[PDB]
């Protein structure tokens, strides 16, 4: 069974919901999710995790003696910490399919600032350390990309189940005077491949040339 | 006073959390975030939500008549429709700022399969409707795509507070054999810039040499 363990001081949003991909995971077996409540490892009265930067800037960086001890007890040197960062390689399918064979993901999250680059340096020397983005909006914290994480990988566990989609339709054929292209259900699986591999095609040079080669 | 409806069939999932960034904005009276049920909108017993494709191939497409309902009883002319979905625009920091200003926004979340393509094509007629994509790893559903596009757009909510950003550092200025480089603690703060630029330009050319061109 894979084991997810999350470290976050935000733990009441990280905690696994019944009724989600995950939720359905988790009660099928396949995997458990646990959540860890960073400040367990402050000992300070209250329960100080980060601190301004050294060379000035702006925001705060989380401190590395908490995140010492906190992956100390979490991790062994066959983990996969991932450390969501703005600043990261890309998060992507490729990397879902690989971290999907995992046995212990360990999830760090933490403030856009960022946390101390000597956490992940330090971490390396143990075990197999992965910062990455899954985005380049701006996130406040790690949290909502750590849910992002678990869901993309879950996803592919085994027993859990190039270029854009074209539309999409279900019953009714006519629905508030909009008809459903008539191949479609014309029922030529030819003709409507044809059909999907144009609508793909134009769609994805509108939204995503960059997925054909192509600039912007 | 933003206001936020999300639709789901995971009504659970989205419920905001009081600990959180959306948490505290809204308790700060800064955002009204409304979560809905899209099983309120179903006809049948089984609160049927979505249906075979036509034109065959795997997986189910969500019922416009279910969706056509719920966006008429929720939106208005004023409303910024949100659809997250793999075949979106992509979603970017540009796009956060401008629906950071928004007075409605409306996230119909469904999953990665789709919504007939009806309902945001009727929507568009009486309101602007956005297809995004939060990116090109596979989710299952929109879910997840709409709290980071929430988290995004209100953190940059007044008062709810092309390169890589460098190392950071803090206290102590030694850790576990390692040292906060020198120059962070030189007090000269030209050179302090200029070192923290080229840590950019390195990370930024190891880790997304995308962002170069
Ligand atoms: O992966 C991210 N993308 C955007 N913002 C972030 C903030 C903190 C951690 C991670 C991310
Ligand atoms: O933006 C998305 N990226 C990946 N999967 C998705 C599934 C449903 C909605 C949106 C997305």
């Given at each position: ?8 001081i ?27 409540d960073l400040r367990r490892?402050t000992?300070?009265?209250?329960k100080?995790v ?167």
């Amino acid at each position: 069974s894979m084991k997810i363990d999350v470290v976050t001081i935000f733990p009441e949003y990280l905690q696994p919901v019944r009724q989600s991909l995950p939720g359905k995971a988790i009660d099928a077996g396949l995997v458990d999710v646990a959540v860890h409540d960073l400040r367990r490892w402050t000992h300070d009265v209250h329960k100080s995790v980060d601190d301004s930067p050294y060379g000035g800037g702006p925001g705060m960086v989380m401190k590395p003696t908490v995140w010492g001890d906190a992956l100390d007890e979490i991790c062994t040197s066959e983990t996969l910490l991932v450390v969501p960062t703005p600043a990261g390689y890309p998060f992507t399918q490729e990397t879902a399919w690989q971290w999907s064979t995992e046995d212990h993901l360990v999830i760090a999250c933490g403030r856009y600032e960022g946390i101390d680059q000597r956490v992940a340096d330090d971490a390396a020397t143990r075990m197999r350390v992965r910062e990455v983005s899954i985005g380049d909006y701006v996130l406040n914290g790690g949290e909502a990309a750590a849910l992002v994480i678990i869901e993309a990988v879950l996803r592919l566990v085994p027993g859990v189940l190039s270029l854009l989609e074209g539309p999409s339709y279900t019953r009714p054929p006519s629905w508030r005077g909009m008809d459903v292209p008539p191949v479609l259900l014309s029922g030529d699986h030819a003709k409507i491949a044809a059909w999907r591999a144009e609508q793909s095609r134009q769609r994805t040079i509108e939204r995503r040339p960059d997925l054909l080669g192509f600039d912007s």
